Structure 1
């Protein structure tokens, strides 16, 4: 399957899966979540534990606005 781009208005956000499969061997951090996670995602999650917060906790991954968002 292909990577996905989140169409944030301030700039597309790429999500590269291969880098996540390799760096986050705890696949249940994202997979096998109960129902609601597709509908639940949005800006609050992305700037929180959905994206940025995990990077902050794992001490690796982009944490600045222009590292995630790129037109």
Structure 2
């Protein structure tokens, strides 16, 4: 429900929105241009300092391609 699925050509990439809404405070970290869609998203950030960035740093979360890219 509140969750969000991102159709991927290598397996859907589940992303706990509501969950990340309880784990992370400031949303500007994800919604720099205010809450909404992120025109430009993709492997780009999803890989760089997008998701893996706020993951590896703490060493927690889908850091492998078998975690994000894996229906």
Question: TM-score, structure 1 length as denominator?
Answer: 0.75
The alignment's C-alpha RMSD in Å is: 2.5
List gaps (5 residues or longer) in structure 1. Answer: none
Structure having the larger proportion of residues in strand = 1
Alpha-carbon distance change, 39 to 31 in structure 1, aligned in 2, over 3 angstroms = closer
Greater Cα shift, 32-41 or 55-64: 32-41
Q: Give the structure 1 partner of residue 37 of structure 2.
A: 37
Alpha-carbon distance change, 36 to 17 in structure 1, aligned in 2, over 3 angstroms = closer
List gaps (5 residues or longer) in structure 2. Answer: none
SS in 2 for 1:12: coil
Greater Cα shift, 17-26 or 61-70: 17-26
Please state how far the C-alpha of 1:64 moved relative to its aligned partner: 0.8
